[PDB]
């Protein structure tokens, strides 16, 4: 037991402390399951054009609501009082109030059956009326190109939905005149009159748009942006494909051939929420709002103050953790940039107000032009990458085990052999 032996043994038992204090650090670091992001910009010569849902901020027209419609659902759509009578009409236009009062007689009126879905599909705004000239990549478009969808805003329309077997439309050039370009007439004179401000009374005009991939359904109620009449609105989109990491690295639901949804063929963070709401309503009181899928009968207007708004508020506010919507491990989303130009120029005001027989004032306050296009033909890709894999773990453990004590797993096996041979 000399000083060389003692010093060497002490240095070994000192170098063995650092080895463990570092190996356990690496093992813990691996078991945190860290990741890092990789952003890239892939240039492409073709991008599939997104689906463009949009619809008027007016749920449904005033010239289409009828005597029958005003009876069953007059109270719901905020035109009649509780006792089937018109509320205070101090701030009421004379002609508008007379054209409503004759619709609210109910003198020996024999009500007919009422279907809320049928009401929306009839009183809602018609694309054949709003759409004045659609264009796509300079080729004339049509009102038959817009598919009818039903949302909380009523009867909305989706362009390039990719549903009903139609092929999704590709775009070949960026820039302004190489995408969708629709002139709309929001029909501001069909808007429901506002006598008194209720909780939900809305004073705005214009339409609401959402730009989404064809996989997910429209969700304009939360994901839309407004565009205003009398304004060329350029919407420069940017495709953005996102790869996420499943557990344990992240929290995402790897896409399977089928969806984990009772009402939707494919899975989406939005389809999940719509499915949750529909299932909750159907299981609670056996009816669905007009905008939900499935087969249950639509709620009658009586079942909206007794079954729809209460249950939906209950689910949203305090009961919010029934359905946890895992967000898919990859999806394409569309960023956007908005800009505006005045419509119409003094040069072409009269041409429009003659092309449509309407007044120049009307054209000024009713006509808008969406112009949705890709800025440049490339897509951003945002990936989550696993930051420390098992091969890296073995490398980092071996390279320092062989730096501090110069051992290997075979050296440990030989040491176990020797320890066994002693004990025998």
């Amino acid at each position, epitope marked *: 037991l000399s000083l060389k032996r003692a010093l060497w043994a002490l240095c070994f038992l000192g170098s063995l402390a650092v080895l463990l204090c570092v190996c356990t650090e690496r093992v813990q670091y691996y078991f945190h399951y860290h990741h890092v992001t990789k952003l890239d910009e892939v240039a492409a010569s073709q991008l599939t054009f997104p689906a463009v849902t949009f619809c008027n901020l007016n749920e449904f027209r005033f010239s289409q609501v009828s005597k029958n419609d005003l009876y069953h659902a007059g109270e719901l759509l905020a035109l009649l009082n509780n006792r089937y009578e018109i509320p205070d009409t101090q701030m009421a236009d004379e002609k508008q109030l007379e054209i409503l009062q004759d619709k609210a007689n109910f003198r020996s009126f024999k009500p007919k059956p009422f279907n809320m879905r049928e009401f929306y599909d009839r009183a809602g705004h018609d694309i054949r009326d709003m759409l004045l000239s659609c264009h796509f990549r300079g080729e004339v478009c049509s009102a038959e190109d817009f598919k009818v969808v039903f949302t909380r805003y009523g009867k909305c329309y989706t362009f390039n939905s990719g549903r009903d077997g139609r092929p999704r439309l590709k775009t070949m050039k960026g820039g302004t005149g190489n995408g969708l370009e629709i002139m709309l007439d929001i029909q501001q004179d069909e808007y429901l009159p506002v006598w008194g401000e209720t909780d939900e009374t809305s004073f705005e005009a214009g339409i609401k748009v959402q730009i989404h991939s064809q996989d997910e359904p429209p969700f304009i109620d939360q994901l839309g942006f407004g565009v205003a009449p009398g304004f060329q609105t350029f919407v420069a989109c940017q495709e953005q494909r996102l790869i996420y990491l499943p557990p344990p690295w992240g929290t995402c639901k790897a896409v399977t051939m089928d969806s984990d949804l*009772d*009402f939707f063929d494919s899975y989406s963070i939005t389809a999940c929420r719509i499915d949750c709401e529909t*299932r*909750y309503l159907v*299981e609670n009181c*056996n009816c669905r709002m007009v905008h939900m899928p499935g087969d249950a009968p639509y709620c009658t207007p009586e079942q909206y103050k007794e079954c729809a708004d209460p249950a939906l508020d209950f689910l949203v506010e305090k009961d919010q953790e029934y359905c946890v919507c895992e967000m898919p491990c990859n999806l394409t989303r569309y960023g956007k940039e908005l800009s505006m130009v005045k419509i119409p120029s003094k040069a072409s005001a009269k041409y429009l107000a003659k092309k449509y027989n309407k007044s120049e004032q009307y054209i000024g306050e009713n006509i808008l032009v969406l112009d949705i296009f890709f800025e440049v033909l490339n897509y951003e890709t945002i990936e989550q990458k696993k930051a420390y894999e098992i091969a890296g773990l073995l490398g980092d453990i071996g390279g320092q085990m062989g730096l501090f004590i110069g051992a290997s797993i075979l050296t440990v096996l030989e040491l176990f052999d020797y320890a066994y041979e002693v004990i025998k």
Partner: nanobody
Amino acid sequence: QVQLVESGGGLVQPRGSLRLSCAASGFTFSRAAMSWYRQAPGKEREMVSTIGSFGVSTNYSDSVKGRFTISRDNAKNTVYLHMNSLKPEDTAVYYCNARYRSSYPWGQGTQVTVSS
């Protein structure tokens, strides 16, 4: 993968009570309506009962009304059919599958025969 195995069903005496259990794997049943079916020997599957994903709503057939009970156990992947007052008219193999999410492998099914 989607197992959806069904167990706990055996031949029973007429006017007897039996309990049928299914173990759905492969999907989050928490958000899946679950239905029971009768494969009549030589005939197509006929729905027996359906329960909502939340368990609040129960649907039955014509002959199943007020004779069967459907129970759904959450976080246990088990659907319970509380059969009662059985008759030979319901002697068939029983299949449990998601009602609205029909594109799934159908399990073997437990045969219950109400003879004696």
